[PDB]
Amino acid sequence: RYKTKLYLWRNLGGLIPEDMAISVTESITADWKQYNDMMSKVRNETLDILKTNKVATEDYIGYIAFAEELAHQVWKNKNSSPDPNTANEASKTDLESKYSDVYGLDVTVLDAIYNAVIPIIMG
Ligand SMILES: CCCCCCCCO[C@@H]1O[C@H](CO)[C@@H](O)[C@H](O)[C@H]1O
């Protein structure tokens, strides 16, 4: 008899501790800041490479787009891959083919970008 109401204790809803909730939002904050810092590094280092190589301004979108697609594939390798290092070199090959074949981009300039983007995403 007294047992009937005791079941209601099991699944009863209640308040969420503020400190635990703040922990959730602080990790999200950390997420977009780390994202932005990584993005600014990749962008700024690519820009330096392009300046150094006296790349035409019409080709900036091509090289920037390359650096970004490479950085994204490298992030995926770091996470999903049991051997990120092997998949990175394969991503390099894949994207360098794509961007020189389709967009006429210079592979020695793409190699420079690669060497900048890798430590940014891996470290
Ligand atoms: C391990 C998680 C179990 C903790 C459940 C109790 C948390 C709810 O507890 C309540 O949280 C409110 C918001 O912080 C405060 O206003 C109350 O003083 C606090 O007792």
PDB file of N, CA and C in Angstrom, residues 10-87:
ATOM      1  N   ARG A  10      11.124   7.518  -8.565  1.00  0.00           N
ATOM      2  CA  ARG A  10      12.104   6.999  -9.528  1.00  0.00           C
ATOM      3  C   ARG A  10      12.394   7.912 -10.720  1.00  0.00           C
ATOM      4  N   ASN A  11      11.343   8.412 -11.357  1.00  0.00           N
ATOM      5  CA  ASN A  11      11.494   9.174 -12.591  1.00  0.00           C
ATOM      6  C   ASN A  11      11.119  10.662 -12.407  1.00  0.00           C
ATOM      7  N   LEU A  12      11.109  11.129 -11.166  1.00  0.00           N
ATOM      8  CA  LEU A  12      10.657  12.472 -10.861  1.00  0.00           C
ATOM      9  C   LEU A  12      11.646  13.491 -11.437  1.00  0.00           C
ATOM     10  N   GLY A  13      11.123  14.478 -12.161  1.00  0.00           N
ATOM     11  CA  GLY A  13      11.936  15.566 -12.698  1.00  0.00           C
ATOM     12  C   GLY A  13      12.347  16.582 -11.635  1.00  0.00           C
ATOM     13  N   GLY A  14      13.423  17.317 -11.900  1.00  0.00           N
ATOM     14  CA  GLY A  14      13.777  18.435 -11.049  1.00  0.00           C
ATOM     15  C   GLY A  14      14.791  19.407 -11.612  1.00  0.00           C
ATOM     16  N   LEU A  15      15.253  20.289 -10.723  1.00  0.00           N
ATOM     17  CA  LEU A  15      16.171  21.368 -11.031  1.00  0.00           C
ATOM     18  C   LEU A  15      17.514  20.852 -11.524  1.00  0.00           C
ATOM     19  N   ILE A  16      18.132  21.617 -12.412  1.00  0.00           N
ATOM     20  CA  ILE A  16      19.489  21.355 -12.882  1.00  0.00           C
ATOM     21  C   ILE A  16      20.436  22.302 -12.125  1.00  0.00           C
ATOM     22  N   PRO A  17      21.480  21.749 -11.480  1.00  0.00           N
ATOM     23  CA  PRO A  17      22.508  22.546 -10.814  1.00  0.00           C
ATOM     24  C   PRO A  17      23.117  23.565 -11.780  1.00  0.00           C
ATOM     25  N   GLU A  18      23.185  24.817 -11.347  1.00  0.00           N
ATOM     26  CA  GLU A  18      23.751  25.872 -12.152  1.00  0.00           C
ATOM     27  C   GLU A  18      25.179  25.560 -12.600  1.00  0.00           C
ATOM     28  N   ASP A  19      26.041  25.127 -11.676  1.00  0.00           N
ATOM     29  CA  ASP A  19      27.437  24.839 -12.059  1.00  0.00           C
ATOM     30  C   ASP A  19      27.590  23.781 -13.175  1.00  0.00           C
ATOM     31  N   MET A  20      26.755  22.751 -13.151  1.00  0.00           N
ATOM     32  CA  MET A  20      26.754  21.739 -14.212  1.00  0.00           C
ATOM     33  C   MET A  20      26.235  22.294 -15.543  1.00  0.00           C
ATOM     34  N   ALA A  21      25.222  23.149 -15.483  1.00  0.00           N
ATOM     35  CA  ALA A  21      24.707  23.793 -16.676  1.00  0.00           C
ATOM     36  C   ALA A  21      25.732  24.763 -17.310  1.00  0.00           C
ATOM     37  N   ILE A  22      26.424  25.530 -16.459  1.00  0.00           N
ATOM     38  CA  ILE A  22      27.478  26.469 -16.882  1.00  0.00           C
ATOM     39  C   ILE A  22      28.664  25.717 -17.486  1.00  0.00           C
ATOM     40  N   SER A  23      28.950  24.549 -16.942  1.00  0.00           N
ATOM     41  CA  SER A  23      29.948  23.695 -17.538  1.00  0.00           C
ATOM     42  C   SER A  23      29.615  23.351 -19.004  1.00  0.00           C
ATOM     43  N   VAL A  24      28.336  23.095 -19.292  1.00  0.00           N
ATOM     44  CA  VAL A  24      27.911  22.759 -20.648  1.00  0.00           C
ATOM     45  C   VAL A  24      28.124  23.940 -21.594  1.00  0.00           C
ATOM     46  N   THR A  25      27.680  25.128 -21.183  1.00  0.00           N
ATOM     47  CA  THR A  25      27.831  26.321 -22.025  1.00  0.00           C
ATOM     48  C   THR A  25      29.273  26.799 -22.183  1.00  0.00           C
ATOM     49  N   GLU A  26      30.084  26.666 -21.133  1.00  0.00           N
ATOM     50  CA  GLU A  26      31.511  26.975 -21.237  1.00  0.00           C
ATOM     51  C   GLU A  26      32.271  26.087 -22.227  1.00  0.00           C
ATOM     52  N   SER A  27      31.854  24.830 -22.390  1.00  0.00           N
ATOM     53  CA  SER A  27      32.519  23.957 -23.364  1.00  0.00           C
ATOM     54  C   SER A  27      32.163  24.340 -24.817  1.00  0.00           C
ATOM     55  N   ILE A  28      30.926  24.778 -25.031  1.00  0.00           N
ATOM     56  CA  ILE A  28      30.479  25.351 -26.298  1.00  0.00           C
ATOM     57  C   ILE A  28      31.279  26.627 -26.627  1.00  0.00           C
ATOM     58  N   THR A  29      31.347  27.562 -25.678  1.00  0.00           N
ATOM     59  CA  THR A  29      32.210  28.740 -25.819  1.00  0.00           C
ATOM     60  C   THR A  29      33.639  28.354 -26.221  1.00  0.00           C
ATOM     61  N   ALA A  30      34.217  27.398 -25.506  1.00  0.00           N
ATOM     62  CA  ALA A  30      35.563  26.917 -25.818  1.00  0.00           C
ATOM     63  C   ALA A  30      35.645  26.366 -27.235  1.00  0.00           C
ATOM     64  N   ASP A  31      34.559  25.736 -27.689  1.00  0.00           N
ATOM     65  CA  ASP A  31      34.465  25.113 -29.015  1.00  0.00           C
ATOM     66  C   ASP A  31      34.558  26.121 -30.166  1.00  0.00           C
ATOM     67  N   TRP A  32      33.790  27.215 -30.109  1.00  0.00           N
ATOM     68  CA  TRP A  32      33.833  28.203 -31.185  1.00  0.00           C
ATOM     69  C   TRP A  32      35.087  29.091 -31.159  1.00  0.00           C
ATOM     70  N   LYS A  33      35.665  29.282 -29.980  1.00  0.00           N
ATOM     71  CA  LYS A  33      36.901  30.049 -29.846  1.00  0.00           C
ATOM     72  C   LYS A  33      38.082  29.275 -30.419  1.00  0.00           C
ATOM     73  N   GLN A  34      38.140  27.983 -30.111  1.00  0.00           N
ATOM     74  CA  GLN A  34      39.189  27.117 -30.637  1.00  0.00           C
ATOM     75  C   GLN A  34      39.024  26.990 -32.165  1.00  0.00           C
ATOM     76  N   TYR A  35      37.772  26.955 -32.617  1.00  0.00           N
ATOM     77  CA  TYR A  35      37.443  26.942 -34.038  1.00  0.00           C
ATOM     78  C   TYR A  35      37.944  28.198 -34.729  1.00  0.00           C
ATOM     79  N   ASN A  36      37.575  29.356 -34.184  1.00  0.00           N
ATOM     80  CA  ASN A  36      38.000  30.641 -34.723  1.00  0.00           C
ATOM     81  C   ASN A  36      39.514  30.856 -34.721  1.00  0.00           C
ATOM     82  N   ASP A  37      40.187  30.406 -33.671  1.00  0.00           N
ATOM     83  CA  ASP A  37      41.637  30.538 -33.590  1.00  0.00           C
ATOM     84  C   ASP A  37      42.353  29.694 -34.655  1.00  0.00           C
ATOM     85  N   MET A  38      41.875  28.469 -34.864  1.00  0.00           N
ATOM     86  CA  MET A  38      42.342  27.560 -35.898  1.00  0.00           C
ATOM     87  C   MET A  38      42.090  28.138 -37.303  1.00  0.00           C
ATOM     88  N   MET A  39      40.928  28.749 -37.490  1.00  0.00           N
ATOM     89  CA  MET A  39      40.532  29.312 -38.781  1.00  0.00           C
ATOM     90  C   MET A  39      41.367  30.542 -39.161  1.00  0.00           C
ATOM     91  N   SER A  40      41.560  31.432 -38.188  1.00  0.00           N
ATOM     92  CA  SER A  40      42.428  32.587 -38.342  1.00  0.00           C
ATOM     93  C   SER A  40      43.890  32.190 -38.617  1.00  0.00           C
ATOM     94  N   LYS A  41      44.405  31.162 -37.954  1.00  0.00           N
ATOM     95  CA  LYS A  41      45.769  30.681 -38.244  1.00  0.00           C
ATOM     96  C   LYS A  41      45.912  30.181 -39.686  1.00  0.00           C
ATOM     97  N   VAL A  42      45.023  29.275 -40.091  1.00  0.00           N
ATOM     98  CA  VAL A  42      44.982  28.734 -41.444  1.00  0.00           C
ATOM     99  C   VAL A  42      44.845  29.836 -42.514  1.00  0.00           C
ATOM    100  N   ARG A  43      43.943  30.793 -42.263  1.00  0.00           N
ATOM    101  CA  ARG A  43      43.751  31.932 -43.153  1.00  0.00           C
ATOM    102  C   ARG A  43      45.004  32.826 -43.230  1.00  0.00           C
ATOM    103  N   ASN A  44      45.539  33.231 -42.084  1.00  0.00           N
ATOM    104  CA  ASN A  44      46.678  34.144 -42.035  1.00  0.00           C
ATOM    105  C   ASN A  44      47.982  33.556 -42.620  1.00  0.00           C
ATOM    106  N   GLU A  45      48.221  32.272 -42.365  1.00  0.00           N
ATOM    107  CA  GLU A  45      49.403  31.586 -42.866  1.00  0.00           C
ATOM    108  C   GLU A  45      49.339  31.328 -44.367  1.00  0.00           C
ATOM    109  N   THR A  46      48.137  31.060 -44.863  1.00  0.00           N
ATOM    110  CA  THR A  46      47.908  30.892 -46.292  1.00  0.00           C
ATOM    111  C   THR A  46      48.142  32.221 -47.004  1.00  0.00           C
ATOM    112  N   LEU A  47      47.565  33.294 -46.466  1.00  0.00           N
ATOM    113  CA  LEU A  47      47.806  34.641 -46.978  1.00  0.00           C
ATOM    114  C   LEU A  47      49.289  34.997 -47.085  1.00  0.00           C
ATOM    115  N   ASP A  48      50.087  34.590 -46.094  1.00  0.00           N
ATOM    116  CA  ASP A  48      51.545  34.852 -46.078  1.00  0.00           C
ATOM    117  C   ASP A  48      52.242  34.088 -47.183  1.00  0.00           C
ATOM    118  N   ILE A  49      51.908  32.805 -47.315  1.00  0.00           N
ATOM    119  CA  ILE A  49      52.400  31.998 -48.420  1.00  0.00           C
ATOM    120  C   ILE A  49      52.078  32.642 -49.788  1.00  0.00           C
ATOM    121  N   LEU A  50      50.848  33.132 -49.961  1.00  0.00           N
ATOM    122  CA  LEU A  50      50.426  33.716 -51.231  1.00  0.00           C
ATOM    123  C   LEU A  50      51.159  35.007 -51.575  1.00  0.00           C
ATOM    124  N   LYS A  51      51.307  35.866 -50.569  1.00  0.00           N
ATOM    125  CA  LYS A  51      52.103  37.082 -50.659  1.00  0.00           C
ATOM    126  C   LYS A  51      53.554  36.782 -51.084  1.00  0.00           C
ATOM    127  N   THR A  52      54.203  35.859 -50.370  1.00  0.00           N
ATOM    128  CA  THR A  52      55.561  35.385 -50.662  1.00  0.00           C
ATOM    129  C   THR A  52      55.716  34.901 -52.112  1.00  0.00           C
ATOM    130  N   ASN A  53      54.724  34.164 -52.602  1.00  0.00           N
ATOM    131  CA  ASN A  53      54.799  33.585 -53.938  1.00  0.00           C
ATOM    132  C   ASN A  53      54.237  34.484 -55.039  1.00  0.00           C
ATOM    133  N   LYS A  54      53.886  35.724 -54.674  1.00  0.00           N
ATOM    134  CA  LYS A  54      53.445  36.736 -55.638  1.00  0.00           C
ATOM    135  C   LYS A  54      52.305  36.175 -56.505  1.00  0.00           C
ATOM    136  N   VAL A  55      51.406  35.476 -55.827  1.00  0.00           N
ATOM    137  CA  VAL A  55      50.192  34.932 -56.416  1.00  0.00           C
ATOM    138  C   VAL A  55      49.228  36.048 -56.844  1.00  0.00           C
ATOM    139  N   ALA A  56      48.654  35.886 -58.039  1.00  0.00           N
ATOM    140  CA  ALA A  56      47.671  36.836 -58.570  1.00  0.00           C
ATOM    141  C   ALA A  56      46.430  36.851 -57.695  1.00  0.00           C
ATOM    142  N   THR A  57      45.862  38.035 -57.516  1.00  0.00           N
ATOM    143  CA  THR A  57      44.722  38.237 -56.627  1.00  0.00           C
ATOM    144  C   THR A  57      43.457  37.480 -57.062  1.00  0.00           C
ATOM    145  N   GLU A  58      43.350  37.212 -58.361  1.00  0.00           N
ATOM    146  CA  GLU A  58      42.248  36.423 -58.916  1.00  0.00           C
ATOM    147  C   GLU A  58      42.312  34.957 -58.461  1.00  0.00           C
ATOM    148  N   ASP A  59      43.501  34.500 -58.066  1.00  0.00           N
ATOM    149  CA  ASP A  59      43.690  33.104 -57.673  1.00  0.00           C
ATOM    150  C   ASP A  59      43.579  32.885 -56.162  1.00  0.00           C
ATOM    151  N   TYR A  60      43.386  33.967 -55.401  1.00  0.00           N
ATOM    152  CA  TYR A  60      43.290  33.885 -53.938  1.00  0.00           C
ATOM    153  C   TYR A  60      42.163  32.973 -53.484  1.00  0.00           C
ATOM    154  N   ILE A  61      40.985  33.068 -54.119  1.00  0.00           N
ATOM    155  CA  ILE A  61      39.834  32.237 -53.729  1.00  0.00           C
ATOM    156  C   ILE A  61      40.140  30.743 -53.857  1.00  0.00           C
ATOM    157  N   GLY A  62      40.883  30.391 -54.909  1.00  0.00           N
ATOM    158  CA  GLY A  62      41.293  29.022 -55.193  1.00  0.00           C
ATOM    159  C   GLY A  62      42.171  28.468 -54.095  1.00  0.00           C
ATOM    160  N   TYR A  63      43.219  29.207 -53.743  1.00  0.00           N
ATOM    161  CA  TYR A  63      44.158  28.774 -52.702  1.00  0.00           C
ATOM    162  C   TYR A  63      43.568  28.759 -51.295  1.00  0.00           C
ATOM    163  N   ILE A  64      42.697  29.729 -51.009  1.00  0.00           N
ATOM    164  CA  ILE A  64      42.032  29.812 -49.722  1.00  0.00           C
ATOM    165  C   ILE A  64      41.082  28.635 -49.557  1.00  0.00           C
ATOM    166  N   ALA A  65      40.308  28.382 -50.611  1.00  0.00           N
ATOM    167  CA  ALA A  65      39.380  27.266 -50.657  1.00  0.00           C
ATOM    168  C   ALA A  65      40.133  25.930 -50.495  1.00  0.00           C
ATOM    169  N   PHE A  66      41.304  25.802 -51.130  1.00  0.00           N
ATOM    170  CA  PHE A  66      42.171  24.629 -50.946  1.00  0.00           C
ATOM    171  C   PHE A  66      42.610  24.426 -49.492  1.00  0.00           C
ATOM    172  N   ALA A  67      43.143  25.479 -48.879  1.00  0.00           N
ATOM    173  CA  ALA A  67      43.605  25.429 -47.492  1.00  0.00           C
ATOM    174  C   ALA A  67      42.483  24.987 -46.548  1.00  0.00           C
ATOM    175  N   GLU A  68      41.282  25.530 -46.762  1.00  0.00           N
ATOM    176  CA  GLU A  68      40.096  25.192 -45.963  1.00  0.00           C
ATOM    177  C   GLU A  68      39.625  23.750 -46.143  1.00  0.00           C
ATOM    178  N   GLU A  69      39.503  23.300 -47.390  1.00  0.00           N
ATOM    179  CA  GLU A  69      39.128  21.915 -47.638  1.00  0.00           C
ATOM    180  C   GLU A  69      40.199  20.943 -47.098  1.00  0.00           C
ATOM    181  N   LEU A  70      41.473  21.314 -47.184  1.00  0.00           N
ATOM    182  CA  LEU A  70      42.539  20.500 -46.576  1.00  0.00           C
ATOM    183  C   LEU A  70      42.449  20.451 -45.035  1.00  0.00           C
ATOM    184  N   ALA A  71      42.287  21.614 -44.405  1.00  0.00           N
ATOM    185  CA  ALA A  71      42.086  21.718 -42.951  1.00  0.00           C
ATOM    186  C   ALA A  71      40.887  20.913 -42.440  1.00  0.00           C
ATOM    187  N   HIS A  72      39.783  20.921 -43.192  1.00  0.00           N
ATOM    188  CA  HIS A  72      38.617  20.109 -42.848  1.00  0.00           C
ATOM    189  C   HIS A  72      38.903  18.607 -42.923  1.00  0.00           C
ATOM    190  N   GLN A  73      39.537  18.151 -44.002  1.00  0.00           N
ATOM    191  CA  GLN A  73      39.872  16.726 -44.141  1.00  0.00           C
ATOM    192  C   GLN A  73      40.870  16.267 -43.064  1.00  0.00           C
ATOM    193  N   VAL A  74      41.791  17.156 -42.697  1.00  0.00           N
ATOM    194  CA  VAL A  74      42.780  16.878 -41.652  1.00  0.00           C
ATOM    195  C   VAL A  74      42.118  16.774 -40.268  1.00  0.00           C
ATOM    196  N   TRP A  75      41.152  17.648 -39.985  1.00  0.00           N
ATOM    197  CA  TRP A  75      40.333  17.530 -38.770  1.00  0.00           C
ATOM    198  C   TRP A  75      39.596  16.178 -38.701  1.00  0.00           C
ATOM    199  N   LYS A  76      38.997  15.761 -39.816  1.00  0.00           N
ATOM    200  CA  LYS A  76      38.362  14.449 -39.907  1.00  0.00           C
ATOM    201  C   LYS A  76      39.342  13.293 -39.688  1.00  0.00           C
ATOM    202  N   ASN A  77      40.553  13.415 -40.231  1.00  0.00           N
ATOM    203  CA  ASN A  77      41.579  12.389 -40.057  1.00  0.00           C
ATOM    204  C   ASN A  77      42.006  12.267 -38.590  1.00  0.00           C
ATOM    205  N   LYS A  78      42.298  13.406 -37.962  1.00  0.00           N
ATOM    206  CA  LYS A  78      42.637  13.473 -36.531  1.00  0.00           C
ATOM    207  C   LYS A  78      41.617  12.742 -35.657  1.00  0.00           C
ATOM    208  N   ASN A  79      40.333  12.931 -35.953  1.00  0.00           N
ATOM    209  CA  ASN A  79      39.256  12.329 -35.168  1.00  0.00           C
ATOM    210  C   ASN A  79      38.928  10.876 -35.525  1.00  0.00           C
ATOM    211  N   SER A  80      38.514  10.653 -36.771  1.00  0.00           N
ATOM    212  CA  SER A  80      37.993   9.355 -37.212  1.00  0.00           C
ATOM    213  C   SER A  80      39.067   8.303 -37.481  1.00  0.00           C
ATOM    214  N   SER A  81      40.221   8.737 -37.983  1.00  0.00           N
ATOM    215  CA  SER A  81      41.252   7.802 -38.431  1.00  0.00           C
ATOM    216  C   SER A  81      42.086   7.196 -37.293  1.00  0.00           C
ATOM    217  N   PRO A  82      42.297   5.860 -37.335  1.00  0.00           N
ATOM    218  CA  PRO A  82      43.246   5.162 -36.452  1.00  0.00           C
ATOM    219  C   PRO A  82      44.705   5.497 -36.792  1.00  0.00           C
ATOM    220  N   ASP A  83      44.930   5.990 -38.010  1.00  0.00           N
ATOM    221  CA  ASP A  83      46.233   6.502 -38.436  1.00  0.00           C
ATOM    222  C   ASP A  83      46.052   7.798 -39.239  1.00  0.00           C
ATOM    223  N   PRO A  84      45.844   8.934 -38.537  1.00  0.00           N
ATOM    224  CA  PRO A  84      45.647  10.250 -39.179  1.00  0.00           C
ATOM    225  C   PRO A  84      46.768  10.672 -40.148  1.00  0.00           C
ATOM    226  N   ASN A  85      48.001  10.277 -39.842  1.00  0.00           N
ATOM    227  CA  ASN A  85      49.189  10.619 -40.626  1.00  0.00           C
ATOM    228  C   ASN A  85      49.169  10.084 -42.073  1.00  0.00           C
ATOM    229  N   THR A  86      48.655   8.869 -42.250  1.00  0.00           N
ATOM    230  CA  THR A  86      48.547   8.242 -43.573  1.00  0.00           C
ATOM    231  C   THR A  86      47.447   8.900 -44.413  1.00  0.00           C
ATOM    232  N   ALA A  87      46.337   9.230 -43.754  1.00  0.00           N
ATOM    233  CA  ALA A  87      45.164   9.796 -44.413  1.00  0.00           C
ATOM    234  C   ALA A  87      45.397  11.247 -44.845  1.00  0.00           C
TER     235      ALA A  87
END
